[PDB]
Amino acid sequence: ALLFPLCLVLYEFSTYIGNDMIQPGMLAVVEQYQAGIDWVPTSMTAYLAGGMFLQWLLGPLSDRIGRRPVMLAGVVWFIVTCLAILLAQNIEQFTLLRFLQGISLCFIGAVGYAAIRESFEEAVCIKITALMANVALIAPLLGPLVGAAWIHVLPWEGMFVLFAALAAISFFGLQRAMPETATRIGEKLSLKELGRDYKLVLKNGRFVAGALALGFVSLPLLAWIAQSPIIIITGEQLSSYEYGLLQVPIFGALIAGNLLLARLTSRRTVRSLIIMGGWPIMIGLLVAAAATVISSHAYLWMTAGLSIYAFGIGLANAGLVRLTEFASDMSKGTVSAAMGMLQMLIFTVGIEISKHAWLNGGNGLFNLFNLVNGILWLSLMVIFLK
Ligand SMILES: C[C@H](CCC(=O)O)[C@H]1CC[C@H]2[C@@H]3CC[C@@H]4C[C@H](O)CC[C@]4(C)[C@H]3C[C@H](O)[C@]12C
Ligand SMILES: CCCCCCCCCO[C@@H]1O[C@H](CO)[C@@H](O)[C@H](O)[C@H]1O
Ligand SMILES: CCCCCCCC
Ligand SMILES: CCCCCCCC
Ligand SMILES: CCCCCCCC
Ligand SMILES: CCCCCC
Ligand SMILES: [Pr+3]
Ligand SMILES: [Pr+3]
């Protein structure tokens, strides 16, 4: 019974470290290919861009042909594309395979989590949702620490063998444990019908504002994940110790913000938690921007600002995700996929803008772009909350 949700969580973990272990490893990757450091954050951009490729299709598709075969195909695709990147002959082919690997991210929410809601009761589903949320918080903390430790002893190729191996364990467990729970098995799938749905959700102004706001507000965190290898190691000329150590207060604060959210949710509305989290979000981004404009190498102030920011994200984002879902009356699969794709668009484009910001203006410009993104979230929250 519970072997199904556990293997889905193991698969979730494997795809999350698929990003988070690789980013510190990208310094070794670009050294092996003799590619520029500008390809380091583009690894994450490709991986994210893959995750918005089939996200629209898979929910409606798996409802018609079965949750089992579609989920198993996504796990097998992840394994094959993880092993396939070892044969990449240049950084362009490497980046292409990061994109193909990224398609595997679509299957977690659209196919896997849909089957969890259909299978289990409301009480058990909430416990599984919380476990998946905890794995999402642990991955970006341990990922860079483990990735940095991995690369000093073992080659980058081994990391993809690890992700494939962890995904292969979840495949066999999902093969045995996952029940078929698709409701519309046998019915026809119309692409024009899907077109009509996704055009209709985008007409909702509050839904779009909330989804866009989630993308803008989390972009500084994702930009840090993408670039912190090249910012700290290449830019500031520091070791993996400093790199790994500076992840702790940032992602520890993100966890702390979520722990505070858990203790406050019974006596706070989602509106108040957005306003309460908004103070650390804006103050954190201001401190990081102002310090690095005053002095480009003020990386401890940057880390302090990002940690205060991350605390507010942990407090505010889950509530905004809920309000954005309530803003649209259309089906949960369409609503989840649409707001997921809107965030991914902002993350992919944002990380590339962030890359060019840092390459042209150093830490100051990196943090100033992140501040603008915080202001765009804040602007949207003024409209979104009347
Ligand atoms: C926002 C979607 C959710 C899609 C959905 O289920 O509808 C999720 C799916 C996969 C998620 C990414 C997986 C890899 C990374 C893991 C880190 O721990 C945080 C940053 C990244 C880059 C994640 C950011 C974001 O949280 C994504 C893109
Ligand atoms: C999915 C989680 C995978 C965890 C695997 C991480 C292995 C990292 C090994 O690091 C190495 O450990 C040695 C001590 O054992 C040190 O001597 C060495 O300096 C260090 O580089
Ligand atoms: C029987 C499996 C069909 C393929 C499902 C995967 C869709 C991308
Ligand atoms: C607002 C904080 C400014 C700190 C400047 C640091 C100078 C090295
Ligand atoms: C060596 C400079 C110390 C800066 C400390 C800033 C912490 C908020
Ligand atoms: C969001 C793009 C969907 C297109 C379906 C034809
Ligand atoms: Pr219709
Ligand atoms: Pr429909």
- Domain residue ranges of the chain, discontinuous segments joined by +: 1-386
Q: Which residue has the tokens 């430790």?
A: 149
Decide whether any atom of ligand 6 lies within 6 Å of the 1 Cβ. Answer: no
Close Cβ partners of 111 (under 8 Å, ≥ 6 residues apart)? 58, 59, 62, 67, 70, 71, 74
Question: Closest residue (by CA) to atom 20 of ligand 2?
Answer: 149
The rounded radius of gyration (Å) of the Cα atoms in the chain is: 20
Give the tokens for residue 40.
Answer: 């380091």
Decide whether any atom of ligand 1 lies within 6 Å of the 156 Cβ. Answer: no
For the CA atoms of 147, 81, 95, 21, the dihedral, rounded to the nearest 10 degrees, stands at -10
In the chain, the amino acid numbered 231 is I
Distance CA 2, CA 14 (A): 19
Close Cβ partners of 129 (under 8 Å, ≥ 6 residues apart)? 113, 116
Decide whether any atom of ligand 1 lies within 6 Å of the 22 Cβ. Answer: no
Segments in the chain forming alpha helices (H): 3-20, 22-33, 39-50, 55-65, 67-84, 91-102, 106-107, 113-119, 122-151, 156-177, 191-202, 205-228, 240-264, 270-294, 299-326, 332-384
Least Cα distance to 302 among 222, 231, 229, 378 occurs for 231
For the CA atoms of 48, 52, 55, 56, the dihedral, rounded to the nearest 10 degrees, stands at 170
> Which protein residues have their CB within 5 A of the ion that is ligand 8?
197
For the CA atoms of 259, 21, 48, 174, the dihedral, rounded to the nearest 10 degrees, stands at -80
SS3 assignment, position 180:
coil
**Centroid of ligand 2 to alpha carbon of 240 (angstroms):** 13
Distance CA 312, CA 277 (A): 4
Distance CA 184, CA 196 (A): 19
Distance CA 366, CA 275 (A): 25
Distance CA 154, CA 156 (A): 7
Q: Which residue has the tokens 């668009």?
A: 345
User: Could you give the count of Cα atoms lying within 13 Å of 212 in the half-sphere of its Cβ?
Assistant: 17
Question: Closest residue (by CA) to atom 2 of ligand 3?
Answer: 69
Least Cα distance to 355 among 143, 21, 23, 45 occurs for 45
Minimum-distance ligand 2 atom for the alpha carbon of 152: 21
Residues with CB under 6 A from ligand 2: 146, 149-150, 152-153
**Centroid of ligand 5 to alpha carbon of 184 (angstroms):** 59
Mutate which of 52, 54, 55, 56 for ligand 6 pocket (most atoms within 8 A of beta carbon) = 56
Minimum-distance ligand 2 atom for the alpha carbon of 166: 1
Question: Closest residue (by CA) to atom 2 of ligand 5?
Answer: 300
Distance CA 95, CA 318 (A): 31
Q: How many CB atoms lie within 10 A of CB 256?
A: 16
Decide whether any atom of ligand 6 lies within 6 Å of the 369 Cβ. Answer: no
Decide whether any atom of ligand 6 lies within 6 Å of the 199 Cβ. Answer: no
Q: Which residue has the tokens 């369409």?
A: 334
Decide whether any atom of ligand 1 lies within 6 Å of the 229 Cβ. Answer: no
**Centroid of ligand 4 to alpha carbon of 306 (angstroms):** 14
